[PDB]
Design a protein around this ligand. Sequence first.
Ligand SMILES: CCCCCCC(=O)OC[C@H](COP(=O)(O)OCC[N+](C)(C)C)OC(=O)CCCCCC
Ligand SMILES: C/C=C(/C)C(=O)O[C@H]1C(C)=C[C@]23C(=O)[C@@H](C=C(CO)[C@@H](O)[C@]12O)[C@H]1[C@@H](C[C@H]3C)C1(C)C
Ligand SMILES: [Zn+2]
Ligand SMILES: [Zn+2]
Length: 52
Amino acid sequence: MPHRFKVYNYMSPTFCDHCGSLLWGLVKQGLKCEDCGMNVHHKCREKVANLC
Ligand SMILES: CCCCCCC(=O)OC[C@H](COP(=O)(O)OCC[N+](C)(C)C)OC(=O)CCCCCC
Ligand SMILES: C/C=C(/C)C(=O)O[C@H]1C(C)=C[C@]23C(=O)[C@@H](C=C(CO)[C@@H](O)[C@]12O)[C@H]1[C@@H](C[C@H]3C)C1(C)C
Ligand SMILES: [Zn+2]
Ligand SMILES: [Zn+2]
């Protein structure tokens, strides 16, 4: 199974589980997988390992 990512709004320091970098911004800072809770930058979504 693929991940199921959704635009998400974080309220605590969250790193991208793909690239290691912080998710920046006050809103919509990245995507969260509905099923496993992975956090990724919008542009990292297409590069992540897709076994959820
Ligand atoms: C200390 C108790 C648990 C920690 C919660 C920390 C917090 O302050 O923010 C609330 C959860 C925390 O993460 P979540 O509760 O969203 O869970 C992570 C992913 N999954 C839902 C799949 C498990 O998410 C955020 O970071 C921000 C969401 C709200 C954004 C509002 C602008
Ligand atoms: C654009 C301006 C800034 C200031 C940022 O990017 O600041 C980022 C930093 C370094 C800490 C912040 C966080 O923990 C936030 C979540 C993340 C997601 O990881 C950080 O992006 C956050 O917005 C929590 C605080 C904001 C802030 C303290 C909010 C949005 C409720
Ligand atoms: Zn997943
Ligand atoms: Zn990333």
